[PDB]
Amino acid sequence: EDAPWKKIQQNTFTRWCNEHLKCVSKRIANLQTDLSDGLRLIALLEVLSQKKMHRKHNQRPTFRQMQLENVSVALEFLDRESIKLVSIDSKAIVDGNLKLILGLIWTLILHYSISMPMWAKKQTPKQRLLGWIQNKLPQLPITNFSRDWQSGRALGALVDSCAPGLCPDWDSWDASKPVTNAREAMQQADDWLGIPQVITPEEIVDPNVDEHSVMTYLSQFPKAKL
């Protein structure tokens, strides 16, 4: 983690998180520290499930035993809801294990933002979303969530697919201007489709952008049932 690209998933997951907590008045500044007492994790779970937790929690969790109980309430909720998790336990969150915490948020995005608004038992959520984009853009070979998006042009194309007239000249856009294109597209999706910029233009056309960051951004397109 010298290289500035390794930070993209973290940036993007965190903006994803804030987007869902912005109306219950919380925000994360640092995912490694700001979920450790369990309170913001609970705020997030409640907004995404549109439910309330099954039992009470420690509203003022001054010491670690209380923070572990809080986190164990988020985690049981998730068992209760049938969201399987990747090697997650309470101490992982309270102790600030960043790789496990990034993985938890990904499990959430994958479930709430991709798997749940798409209804295909033998169809993976990566596959559902791939298929949704391919259906909006039948004239583009769309096979991945990285290199296909690097020029900015598939973005123009998807946004215009969704609201024709927003990026009508996408196919004449200069692929040597990947940031300019990305920004033009993603602003038009911001302004006219409601799609927030949880990944930045610079980040989305980065040579080493990870697919999970890009899926996070794109998954907002059909959860907004376009």
UniProtKB/Swiss-Prot annotation:
Tissue specificity of this protein: Ubiquitous.
Post-translational modification: Phosphorylation extent changes in response to cell activation. Polyubiquitination in the CH1 domain by a SCF-like complex containing ASB2 leads to proteasomal degradation. Prior dissociation from actin may be required to expose the target lysines. Ubiquitinated in endothelial cells by RNF213 downstream of the non-canonical Wnt signaling pathway, leading to its degradation by the proteasome.
Domain Calponin-homology (CH), residue spans: 7-113, 123-226
Cross-link (Glycyl lysine isopeptide (Lys-Gly) (interchain with G-Cter in ubiquitin)): K6, K7, K99
Domain of life of the native organism: Eukaryota
Location of the protein in the cell: Cytoplasm, Cell cortex; Cytoplasm, Cytoskeleton; Perikaryon; Cell projection, Growth cone
Residue numbers spanned by region Actin-binding: 1-226
Subunit structure: Homodimer. Interacts with PDLIM2. Interacts with RFLNA and RFLNB. Interacts with FCGR1A, FLNB, FURIN, HSPB7, INPPL1, KCND2, MYOT, MYOZ1, ARHGAP24, PSEN1, PSEN2 and ECSCR. Also interacts with various other binding partners in addition to filamentous actin. Interacts (via N-terminus) with MIS18BP1 (via N-terminus). Interacts (via N-terminus) with TAF1B. Interacts with TMEM67 (via C-terminus) and MKS1. Interacts (via actin-binding domain) with MICALL2 (via CH domain). Interacts (via filamin repeat 5) with SYK; docks SYK to the plasma membrane.
Similarity annotation: Belongs to the filamin family.
Described function: Promotes orthogonal branching of actin filaments and links actin filaments to membrane glycoproteins. Anchors various transmembrane proteins to the actin cytoskeleton and serves as a scaffold for a wide range of cytoplasmic signaling proteins. Interaction with FLNB may allow neuroblast migration from the ventricular zone into the cortical plate. Tethers cell surface-localized furin, modulates its rate of internalization and directs its intracellular trafficking. Involved in ciliogenesis.
Notes on the domains: Comprised of a NH2-terminal actin-binding domain, 24 immunoglobulin-like internally homologous repeats and two hinge regions. Repeat 24 and the second hinge domain are important for dimer formation. Filamin repeat 20 interacts with filamin repeat 21 masking the ligand binding site on filamin repeat 21, resulting in an autoinhibited conformation. The autoinhibition can be relieved by ligands like ITGB7 or FBLIM1. Filamin repeats 19 and 21 can simultaneously engage ligands.
Disease implicated: Periventricular nodular heterotopia 1: A developmental disorder characterized by the presence of periventricular nodules of cerebral gray matter, resulting from a failure of neurons to migrate normally from the lateral ventricular proliferative zone, where they are formed, to the cerebral cortex. PVNH1 is an X-linked dominant form. Heterozygous females have normal intelligence but suffer from seizures and various manifestations outside the central nervous system, especially related to the vascular system. Hemizygous affected males die in the prenatal or perinatal period. Otopalatodigital syndrome 1: X-linked dominant multiple congenital anomalies disease mainly characterized by a generalized skeletal dysplasia, mild intellectual disability, hearing loss, cleft palate, and typical facial anomalies. OPD1 belongs to a group of X-linked skeletal dysplasias known as oto-palato-digital syndrome spectrum disorders that also include OPD2, Melnick-Needles syndrome (MNS), and frontometaphyseal dysplasia (FMD). Remodeling of the cytoskeleton is central to the modulation of cell shape and migration.
Protein name: Filamin-A
Organism: Homo sapiens (Human)
Originating gene: FLNA
Whole-protein coverage range: 37 to 269 of 2647
